[PDB]
Curated annotation (Swiss-Prot), chain B:
The name this protein goes by in its record: Proteasome assembly chaperone 2
Modified residues (Phosphothreonine): 137
Effect of residue 225 to K: In PRAAS4; uncertain significance
GO molecular function: molecular adaptor activity
UniProt source species: Homo sapiens
Lineage of producing organism: Eukaryota, Metazoa, Chordata, Craniata, Vertebrata
Swiss-Prot record, chain E:
Residues with Phosphoserine modification: 16
Protein family: Belongs to the peptidase T1A family.
Gene it is expressed from: PSMA5
Subunit structure, interactors included: The 26S proteasome consists of a 20S proteasome core and two 19S regulatory subunits. The 20S proteasome core is a barrel-shaped complex made of 28 subunits that are arranged in four stacked rings. The two outer rings are each formed by seven alpha subunits, and the two inner rings are formed by seven beta subunits. The proteolytic activity is exerted by three beta-subunits PSMB5, PSMB6 and PSMB7. PSMA5 interacts directly with the PSMG1-PSMG2 heterodimer which promotes 20S proteasome assembly.
Induction (record text): Up-regulated in colon cancer cell lines. Up-regulated in fetal Down syndrome (DS) brain (at protein level). May be the target of the transcriptional activator NFE2L2.
Protein name: Proteasome subunit alpha type-5
Whole sequence portion shown: 1 to 49 of 241
Organismal lineage: Eukaryota, Metazoa, Chordata, Craniata, Vertebrata
Protein species of origin: Homo sapiens
Protein's cellular compartments: Cytoplasm; Nucleus
Curated annotation (Swiss-Prot), chain G:
Modified residue annotations for Phosphotyrosine: 6, 24, 76, 121
Highest taxon, organism lineage: Eukaryota
PTM annotation: Phosphorylated on tyrosine residues; which may be important for nuclear import.
Name of the protein in question: Proteasome subunit alpha type-2
Modified sites of kind N-acetylalanine: 2
Swiss-Prot record, chain I:
PTM sites of type N-acetylalanine: 2
N6-acetyllysine, modified sites: 253
This protein's encoding gene: PSMG1
Record's protein name: Proteasome assembly chaperone 1
Positions where Phosphoserine occurs in the chain: 169
UniProt PTM: Degraded by the proteasome upon completion of 20S proteasome maturation.
Region spans: Disordered: 13-35
GO molecular function, one term: proteasome binding
Assembly notes: Forms a heterodimer with PSMG2. The PSMG1-PSMG2 heterodimer interacts directly with the PSMA5 and PSMA7 proteasome alpha subunits.
Species whose genome carries this gene: Homo sapiens (Human)
Bilayer-spanning residue ranges: none
GO BP annotation list: cerebellar granule cell precursor proliferation; chaperone-mediated protein complex assembly; proteasome core complex assembly
Primary localization class, coarse: cytoplasm
Modified residues (Phosphothreonine): 18, 54
Length: 246, 264, 245, 127, 49, 241, 232, 239, 277, 96
């Protein structure tokens, strides 16, 4: 009736501990994913922005899982480390058995089965991690999935997780054009949204990391944009907002 | 409501009402037994309400065979007009959704009957004591804003510790502060309603757990006796302590009944 | 008792308090004082001495069975302070772990490695919800090979450390101050001077002039590395030699 | 010739798709002399240690070791994810030795792992 | 003295101070939510309705 | 120590495990057993309480034979005492099987006491609510008397009393110069002490349960023979008045 | 302070998503003895304050600055036994990496594996988090590394940091005095000064511990070397 | 009142040094129906009162057969009685298999004592809520044993357990001086009169509510029920 | 609550009922989804006096529409059986209402009879188990708010001997035994020892005795402390001393036929379940 | 299983006893995992014909069975049992 365990339903059928697990992400940094006609992207807010923090691994939030997929976590960081390790393992196990790269939804489904197992057996805290997956496979092409602590995934054409995900989702839903998106327009929309939802500070190409996925000559190219390109995108947005004002 | 024993109200003109709360360990109720027994107070009425599970038994303060057969119900009022003291003793547990109605009925009686002060003897959960409260004294107090009739200075001179104000709703960094006596039962309801009604209430409590809670009751009556002097002040005697609160005869077989044979 | 964790900041071993303190471990440290006995261990130039109170409050009790000095290996002895059964069980565990070390590594366990092993086990007790710390303190002595005398003190939290002199029990703080004052002056006590130091610490912080039957003394020496427990005649000789001076 | 066909009662049921390829014909004579010696090595080492503790010290010693082992192995990770056995190694004494189980055929990267719920409820004895 | 809450029925394996296990009698109450079944044993057979 | 006393794995704010203390009080729940060690043996005696006249004499015995040379006198819960008798018998038999000779009494006491302690450690089991005494005799070891209590603490005694009236019986044992007495005079004095501390009104109609191991039994634990027990009971009665 | 039992369980989120038993384990770290890590241009410095501060301690016995391999070293602030159990595990993990790949483990790989162990301990129930936050200093690929792993199992790469008591003031001090081009010697001076900030009286070479990591590998400074650094 | 924290589990010692779930299990024994056991020099008989809701049901099976020389009468929870009876039967089979001889009654009862002592110390268990009256015959003669939920067992000259069994025990204490030289017929009559003493003054023993089980020097354990008890009940003088 | 998994944090029982928080953090924004549920649950568990051939809406308290001079309440199986066998075996008794109430443990509700020869005499026959939050409603539906002090209430009930608090064992006491508890206006002495001082009674019998104490009505409560709380012949016979008391003076005509009625009513015997023997 | 092993039909009481052995194994969960952990909330009425003619058995949430001659189980078992009390006589035809 109450909310002390994951293995207890309230008398209206609510699993309150899972709902609290899902409440931990709303604190975490804003991760944004946008699907285009020629690629996918992940725009993530650099939450750890202290002065004495070191220049780190190629990305704080963006993780490579295959040759073909990348993820972008939001939530508890240690749970996220465990989960990305297991994602990479699952993908290499599929490749070992079938000699083909794992399709994107099968990887998402496997991880979400793991997360649901932690929301079902008692005496195990669920994973306070909401992931955001981008990939390519020969079945459905460019794909973008989302996952939440309950092991509950879904495929999107543009979604956001983390802090201010609702304002970002409203803005995407207003501005995302289905079918007429290219990767440059998706990057413009990503900067615009990730600007209006990071209103604790002014957007600069040191609090955002952007990774794009494309296909070039029969190979997938997961590429994390360099700091000198995100600045050019931010300038393009600022000049656009100046023009649209007056 | 208050029902007298003799078709006449006893005129509690400026009396101090001592009452328990049905709190963790029954420490408030056990302390009230100690006070009523030691002061040798005489029953003056009943507090008949819908709010406490009904119970009945003969005189819990029997001393002679004459008065050992006096029936008692779950809520009974005792008095000592020499010291202008009136005492309530709740001997039961509250019925679901009925604690608040009892609190408004009781406080309406306090305002109508003319009682000056109210003193609530209570307790709280000691498993919820934080870092500091573990290394402090078990006893805490609360005074409603009206209760200032030169007793704020007295309590200050006694070097007592006020009940710590927790934040009304957690998870908010602003943390608006209001009292929270977890396991005090009606203690918080009584405090809030006294503050609303402008009644001089004091709450004295101890952080206790459950089990043999007779040491806790004796400690709480010694706290109250530091304040009120309802008894000769503590370590002033040739250690005639342990003989200075009269244990009621009903405090017998407190762990149940006798040991069955063929075990041990 | 069956199972579960008691709710409260000081009522289960695996609960932190708001200040990040494990209070059940500190309550185990208070359990060390359950017994009312103090132990002194003093390290010298070529010897280590453990000295403990021997209270036998019973005419009917066979006094040769009351002892807190134990032999872990042939060359390591310890004085246990705290709850008596917990002390004897931790001695049994130390004995087993020392035998395993000799089995695995082909040479006899050092003192630091034995206290490290016992403290690793104690840490495991503090982290899990089924077990509890032992309310006891182990002070180990031995002669190593090339370091010299060793006095080590494991404790209920899983902490261990080597010392030049240490105390456990009721008068641990008073004895520690006494030994600090003694060690600041000079430290190369021969063998007699270490025994006099340990006995004087115990008999000063307790303000008790000792009898050979109110005190236990176990020693190791560089020339005689084997743990030895002095007979009452030897302790009485030390006490009369201390009194005459 | 193993006898033992519980065949009095060979009524047991198996999951055909999950049993894989089982050949009880050859499951009576290990494939190598070292197969079982290595499969059950921590088991046999625990049994040897409990036996020496029993014979030298008494019932209490193996009981306390088994009780500690049972306790630490129970605040663990659900079977479809690899655990560290940090406390169990500290208890068993493997916190400072590396064997061949530690470096060969790493359990942390299994190359094959089952379904989460199937592996959890197999550990629970439910099949 | 006082009336206090005593609960011996919220878990199996707990006898009440009366020698009585309440979680089994609550299962018999669970029977009383079923539908009525009548069985009569005669010498010509047994009927189940 | 309320709040810290529902588990044998909880420490009171002053380092006291209270379930173990309550188990020792559980031992104080039962009638008294005394054991006296003399110059040439050990003598046990139990103030055994007659539960009914319907029980066959000898039932509910509290003086076990743990080995050929060891005898055990118990108090506390009798089911716990029987389980610990089984454990002690297992320990003695296992030692003899491994090492080929009778287990020393000190070693047996250590093994059983460490079992009792192991129960004082976990939330999964409760401490034994039973205390007992072991007593042996060997030509190469002398008489030996040990008492283990529910906390797992075993010491060696010259005279012990466990049970309800352990304090009065201990006062009465201290008057005996047991270090220079034989088993016969000790049997008479054990009967006397059992009769003295018996509470004739609260408890009712007890029966003596005397046992020795000594050189008069050649290091073999036995029940005191019927005639010597009769003499001891007659001495004990005549001394009471 | 018992928020409806959200405070006492490790496996219960609070209604706001917090896990207020892993942040109580972070209050054990912030109540430990101060630690400092400074990643200079050619090395890392690990300075801590010793709790064994009296004359009666053998100082060849137990240390707070430990080596993992030749090139990795730890310091902690928090609960010492948890540190020791994690140190032996980190040493085992480093040797397993060597045995498999025939190369010394990188600092980041070691930090990841240790952090996974800590994370495991923050998710089961019936167990307790670790009361230590580690600083790992390493030297790989001609490049210093300074990491920090906290009781939750979430590690951070730092240029400079401070743990233990008075670490917010320590970090503020470090911000004003750290520059990337710092050499290892000036880093040792700055680390000793940052310790001297929050320190309980006179600071001797015998009540602080320093360990450096440069090209030559991780090394714990002897009391004479610390004495010399303190004299300047 | 101060008892509530210490009586919900069999692993909690009350600060008076009492396990209370053990005593509550003993009450569970008192909630059965009276059964009597008594022995002579040659026979050991078990007499039990059956309840059948007073109509339309075959009565409880209160006397059970454990071996050719051991039989038990139960009072208390039926599930526990069946668990313990399965244990007793398996132990008797094991004795016959390994040693070819009938398991001694005292050894069987000791095994029951250990088996039923384990639940009274362990977590997640409850004591056995059944008390037994074991009637045996071995090399040492007839035997009557009483086992309890507390895991105690008693060697009885005669014993009654169950609901309102104090009256039967008063009768047996009054008349036990003549049980030994009684033959089978009047020994079973003595047991029948005790069991009748456990009844209201109006109710009387009939074939429908009396079960008898004899073991003895020549007999194997036989149970007499519902019409076989008539030879024993015919000669029983009125109350 | 009791540790569903390993190391689950468990809170101890509270005998003062303060683990319910008394519905703390009241939530003045109670959803109508919640209020409908609360009111529906309150309606399900309501007490309701209803008259025969009227079947609903008695609308007034039962003792204030009919005059009364004697009122015998029997509570539980054994008290009801005793009262029926030994009192309704006489002249005609007329039913004047039941008290329908729903409960988890509720089981014939009190039917109220008033003697035709003497309309002032009344009987409540509860096998009805009235829960705590129904006892005061029962009191107001039966007695009301005009407590005329001419009545002589006589409550009869049974309790298990293990509820007796005694220094001996509650297995050595000679069950069943009768204990009394009378109010202050009950001038006559009891036919049984008065219940002791640490012993209390807490239920509908306590509700009626408390009502009669507060409002100064004579009342006697007879407690049978029995070792068999099912329908038992010895337990029912334990109440017989009461028959020689002024309240039950003219109502007991034929005792010899009452034993036969009692034996028959025992042969009815609501079926026991197989938990035992 | 009985037919396989012994080549004959299991009697009504033996089937009821086997079902009871399964049904009385609650509590004691950490002893044989896959056990039930609470009483079964079902009462059964085994009615069969065997070597001893027609037989009717009753099992309730206890794992315990008793042979009967007329049982009612369910929500109106008290009223239906009181009715079976008189309408039943030990020699009545199956049609009645």
């Amino acid at each position: 009736r109450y909310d002390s365990r994951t293995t207890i339903f309230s008398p209206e059928g609510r699993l309150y501990q899972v709902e609290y697990a899902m409440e931990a992400i709303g604190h975490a940094g804003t991760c944004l994913g946008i699907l285009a006609n020629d690629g996918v992207l992940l725009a993530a807010e650099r939450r750890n922005i202290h002065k004495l923090l070191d220049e780190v691994f190629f990305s704080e939030k963006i993780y490579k899982l295959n040759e073909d997929m990348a993820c972008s976590v939001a939530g508890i960081t240690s749970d996220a480390n465990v989960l990305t390790n297991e994602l990479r393992l699952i993908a290499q196990r599929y490749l070992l058995q079938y000699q083909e790269p794992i399709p994107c939804e099968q990887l998402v489904t496997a991880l979400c089965d793991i997360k649901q197992a932690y929301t079902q057996f008692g005496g195990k805290r669920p994973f306070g991690v909401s992931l955001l997956y981008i990939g390519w496979d020969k079945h459905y092409g460019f794909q973008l999935y989302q996952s939440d602590p309950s092991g509950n995934y879904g495929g999107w054409k543009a979604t956001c997780i983390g802090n201010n995900s609702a304002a970002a989702v409203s803005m995407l839903k207003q501005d995302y054009k289905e079918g007429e998106m290219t990767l440059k327009s998706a990057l413009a929309l990503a900067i615009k949204v990730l600007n209006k939802t990071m209103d604790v500070s002014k957007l600069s190409a040191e609090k955002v990391e952007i990774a794009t996925l494309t296909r070039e000559n029969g190979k997938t190219v997961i590429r994390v944009l360099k700091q000198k390109e995100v600045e050019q995108l931010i300038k393009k947005h600022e000049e656009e907002e100046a023009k649209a004002e007056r | 409501m208050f029902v007298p024993c003799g078709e006449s109200a006893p005129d509690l003109a400026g009396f101090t009402l001592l009452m328990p709360a049905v709190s963790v360990g029954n420490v408030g109720q056990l302390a009230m037994d100690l006070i009523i027994s030691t002061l040798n107070m005489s029953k003056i009425g009943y507090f008949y309400t819908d709010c406490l599970v009904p119970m009945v038994g003969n005189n819990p303060y029997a001393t002679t065979e004459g008065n050992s057969t006096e029936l008692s119900i779950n809520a009974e009022v005792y008095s000592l007009p020499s010291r202008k003291l009136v005492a309530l003793q709740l001997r039961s547990i509250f019925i679901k959704y009925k604690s608040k109605p009892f609190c408004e009925k009781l406080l309406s009686w306090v305002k109508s009957s003319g009682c000056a002060r109210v003193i609530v003897l209570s307790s709280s959960h000691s498993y919820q004591r934080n870092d500091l409260q573990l290394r402090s004294t078990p006893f805490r107090y609360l005074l409603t804003p009206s209760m200032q009739k030169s007793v704020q200075n007295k309590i200050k001179s006694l070097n007592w510790e006020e009940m710590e104000k927790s934040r009304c709703i957690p998870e908010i960094d602003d943390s608006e502060f209001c009292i929270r006596i977890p396991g005090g039962g009606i203690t918080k309801t009584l405090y809030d309603e006294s503050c609303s009604k402008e009644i001089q209430m004091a709450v004295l409590l101890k952080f206790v757990s459950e089990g043999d809670n007779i040491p806790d009751a004796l400690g709480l009556v010694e706290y109250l006796n530091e304040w009120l002097q309802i008894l000769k002040p503590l370590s002033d005697d040739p250690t005639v302590s342990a003989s200075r609160w009269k244990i009621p005869s009903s405090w017998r077989l407190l762990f149940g009944s006798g040991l069955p044979p063929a075990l041990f | 008792m069956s199972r579960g964790s008691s709710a409260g900041f000081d009522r289960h071993i695996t609960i932190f308090s708001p200040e990040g303190r494990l209070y059940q471990v500190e309550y185990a440290f208070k359990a060390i004082n359950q017994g009312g006995l103090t132990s002194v261990a003093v390290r010298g130039k070529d010897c280590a001495v453990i000295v403990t109170q021997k209270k036998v409050p019973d005419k009917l009790l066979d006094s040769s069975t009351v002892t807190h000095l134990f032999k872990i290996t042939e060359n390591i002895g310890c004085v246990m302070t705290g709850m008596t059964a917990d002390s004897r069980s931790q001695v049994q565990r130390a004995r087993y772990e020392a035998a395993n070390w000799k089995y695995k590594y082909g040479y006899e366990i050092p003192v630091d490695m034995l206290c490290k092993r016992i403290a690793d086990i104690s840490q495991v007790y503090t982290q899990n919800a089924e077990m509890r710390p032992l309310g006891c303190c182990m002070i180990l002595i031995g002669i190593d090979e090339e370091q010299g005398p060793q006095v080590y003190k494991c404790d209920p939290a899983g902490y261990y450390c080597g010392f030049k002199a240490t105390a456990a029990g009721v008068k641990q703080t008073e004895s520690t101050s006494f030994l600090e004052k003694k060690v600041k002056k000079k430290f190369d006590w021969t063998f007699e001077q270490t025994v006099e130091t340990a006995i004087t610490c115990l008999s000063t912080v307790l303000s008790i002039d000792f009898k050979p039957s109110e005190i236990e003394v176990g020693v190791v020496t560089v020339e005689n590395p084997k743990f030895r427990i002095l007979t009452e005649a030897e302790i009485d000789a030390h006490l009369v030699a201390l009194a005459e001076r | 010739p193993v006898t033992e066909l519980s065949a009095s009662g060979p009524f047991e049921s198996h999951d055909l798709l999950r049993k894989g390829f089982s050949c009880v014909k050859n499951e009576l004579l290990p494939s190598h002399p070292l197969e079982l010696s290595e499969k059950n090595f921590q088991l046999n080492q625990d049994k040897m240690n409990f036996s020496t503790l029993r014979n030298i010290q008494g019932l209490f010693a193996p009981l306390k070791l088994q009780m500690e082992f049972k306790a630490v192995q129970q605040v663990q990770r659900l079977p479809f994810l690899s655990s560290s056995n940090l406390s169990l190694d500290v208890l068993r004494g493997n916190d400072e030795t590396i064997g061949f189980e530690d470096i060969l055929n790493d359990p942390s990267q299994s190359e094959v792992m089952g379904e989460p719920h199937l592996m959890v409820e197999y550990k629970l004895g439910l099949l | 003295m006082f009336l206090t809450r005593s609960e011996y029925d919220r878990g199996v394996n707990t006898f009440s101070p009366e020698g009585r296990l309440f979680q089994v009698e609550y299962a018999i109450e669970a029977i009383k939510l079923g539908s009525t079944a009548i069985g009569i044993q005669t010498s010509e057979g047994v009927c189940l309705a | 120590g309320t709040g810290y006393d529902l588990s044998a794995s909880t420490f009171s704010p002053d380092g006291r495990v209270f379930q173990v203390e309550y188990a020792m009080k559980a031992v104080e729940n039962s009638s008294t057993a005394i054991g006296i060690r003399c110059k040439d043996g050990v003598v046990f005696g139990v103030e055994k309480l007659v539960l009914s006249k319907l029980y066959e004499e000898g039932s509910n015995k509290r003086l076990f034979n743990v080995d050929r040379h060891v005898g055990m006198a118990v108090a506390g819960l009798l089911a716990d005492a029987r389980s610990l008798a089984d454990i002690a018998r297992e320990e003695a038999s296992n030692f003899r099987s491994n090492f080929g000779y009778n287990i020393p009494l000190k070693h047996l006491a250590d093994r059983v006491a460490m079992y009792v302690h192991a129960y004082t450690l976990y939330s999964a089991v409760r401490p034994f609510g039973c205390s007992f005494m072991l007593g042996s005799y060997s030509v190469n070891d002398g008489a030996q008397l040990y008492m283990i209590d529910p906390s797992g603490v075993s010491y060696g005694y010259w005279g012990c009393a466990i049970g309800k009236a352990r304090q009065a019986a201990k006062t009465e044992i201290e008057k005996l110069q047991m270090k220079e007495m034989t088993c016969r005079d000790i049997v008479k004095e054990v009967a006397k002490i059992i009769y003295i501390v018996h509470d004739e009104v609260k408890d009712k109609a007890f029966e003596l349960e005397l046992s020795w191991v000594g050189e008069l039994t050649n290091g073999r634990h036995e029940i005191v023979p019927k005639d010597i027990r009769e003499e001891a009971e007659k001495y004990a009665k005549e001394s009471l008045k | 302070m018992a928020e409806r039992g959200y405070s006492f369980s490790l496996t219960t989120f609070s209604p706001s998503g917090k896990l207020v038993q892993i942040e109580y384990a972070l209050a054990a770290v912030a109540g430990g003895a101060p630690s400092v890590g400074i990643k200079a241009a050619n090395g890392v410095v690990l300075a801590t304050e010793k709790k064994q501060k009296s004359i009666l301690y053998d100082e060849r016995s137990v240390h707070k600055v430990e080596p993992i391999t030749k090139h990795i070293g730890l310091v902690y602030s928090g609960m010492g036994p948890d540190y020791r159990v994690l140190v032996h595990r980190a040493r085992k993990l480093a040797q397993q990496y060597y045995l498999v790949y025939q190369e010394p483990i990188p600092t980041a790989q070691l930090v990841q594996r240790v952090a996974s162990v800590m994370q495991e301990y923050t998710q089961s129930g019936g167990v307790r988090p670790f009361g230590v936050s580690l600083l790992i200093c390493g030297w790989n690929e001609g490049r210093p590394y300074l990491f920090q792993s906290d009781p939750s199992g979430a590690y951070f790469a730092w240029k400079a940091t401070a743990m233990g008591k008075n670490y917010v003031n320590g970090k503020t001090f470090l911000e004003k005095r750290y520059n990337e081009d710092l050499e290892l010697e000036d880093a040792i001076h700055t680390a000793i000064l940052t310790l001297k900030e929050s320190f309980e009286g006179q600071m001797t070479e015998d009540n602080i511990e320093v360990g450096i990591c440069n090209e030559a590998g991780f090394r714990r400074l002897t009391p004479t070397e610390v004495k010399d650094y303190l004299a300047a | 009142m101060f008892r509530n924290q210490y009586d919900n589990d069999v692993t909690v010692w009350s600060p008076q040094g009492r396990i209370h779930q053990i005593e509550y299990a003993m009450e569970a024994v008192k909630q059965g129906s009276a059964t009597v056991g008594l022995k002579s020099k040659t026979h050991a008989v078990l007499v039990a009162l059956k309840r059948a809701q007073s109509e339309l049901a075959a009565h409880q099976k209160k006397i059970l057969h454990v071996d050719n020389h051991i039989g038990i009468s139960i009072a208390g929870l039926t599930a526990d009685a069946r668990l313990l009876c399965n244990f007793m039967r398996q132990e008797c089979l094991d004795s016959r298999f390994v040693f070819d001889r009938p398991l001694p009654v005292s050894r069987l009862v000791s095994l029951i004592g250990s088996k039923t002592q384990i639940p009274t110390q362990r977590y997640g268990r409850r004591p056995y809520g059944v008390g037994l009256l074991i009637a045996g015959y071995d090399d040492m003669g007839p035997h009557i044993f009483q086992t309890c939920p507390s895991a105690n067992y008693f060697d009885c000259r005669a014993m009654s357990i169950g609901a309102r069994s104090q009256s039967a025990r008063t009768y047996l204490e009054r008349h036990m001086s003549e049980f030994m030289e009684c033959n089978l017929n009047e020994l079973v009559k003595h047991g029948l009169r005790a069991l009748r003493e456990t009844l209201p003054a109006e109710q009387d023993l009939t074939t429908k509510n009396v079960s008898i089980g004899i073991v003895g020097k020549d007999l194997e354990f036989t149970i007499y029920d519902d019409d076989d008890v008539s030879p024993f009940l015919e000669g029983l003088e009125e109350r | 609550m009791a540790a569903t998994f390993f190391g689950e944090v468990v809170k101890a029982p509270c005998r003062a009922g303060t683990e319910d928080e008394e519905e703390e953090e009241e939530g003045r924004r109670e959803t109508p989804e919640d209020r409908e549920v609360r009111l529906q649950l309150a309606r399900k568990r309501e007490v309701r006096l209803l008259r025969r051939q009227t079947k609903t809406s008695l609308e007034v308290s039962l003792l204030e529409k009919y005059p009364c001079s004697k009122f015998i309440i029997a509570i539980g199986n054994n008290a009801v059986a005793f009262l029926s066998s030994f009192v309704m075996n006489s002249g005609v008794w007329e039913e004047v209402g039941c008290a329908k109430l729903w409960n988890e443990w509720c089981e014939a509700f009190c039917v109220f009879y008033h003697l035709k020869s003497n309309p002032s005499v009344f009987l409540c026959q509860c096998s009805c188990y009235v829960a705590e939050d129904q006892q005061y409603q029962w009191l107001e539906k039966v007695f009301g708010s005009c407590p005329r002090k001419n009545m002589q209430i006589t409550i009869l009930t049974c309790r298990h001997v293990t509820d007796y608090k005694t220094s001996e064992s509650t297995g050595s006491l000679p069950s069943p035994f009768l204990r009394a508890l009378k109010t202050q206006n009950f001038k006559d002495s009891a036919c049984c020892p008065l219940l002791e001082q640490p012993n209390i009674v807490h239920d509908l019998p306590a509700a009626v005795l408390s009502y009669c104490q507060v409002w100064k009505i004579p009342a006697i409560l007879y407690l049978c402390y029995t070792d068999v709380m099912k329908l038992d012949l010895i337990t029912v016979e334990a109440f017989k001393p009461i028959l020689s008391t002024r309240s039950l003076k003219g109502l007991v005509k034929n005792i010899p036929q009452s034993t036969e009625i009692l034996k028959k009513l025992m042969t009815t015997n609501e079926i026991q379940s197989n938990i035992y023997t | 299983n009985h037919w396989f092993t012994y080549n004959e039909t299991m009697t009504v009481e033996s089937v009821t006893q086997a079902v009871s052995n399964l049904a009385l194994q609650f509590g004691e969960e950490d002893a044989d995992p896959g056990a039930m952990s609470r009483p079964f909330g079902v009462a059964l009425l085994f009615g069969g014909v065997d070597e001893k003619g027609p037989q009717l058995f009753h099992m309730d949430p206890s794992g315990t069975f008793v042979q009967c001659d007329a049982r009612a189980i369910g929500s109106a078992s008290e009223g239906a049992q009181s009715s079976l009390q008189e309408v039943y006589h030990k020699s009545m035809t199956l049609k009645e």
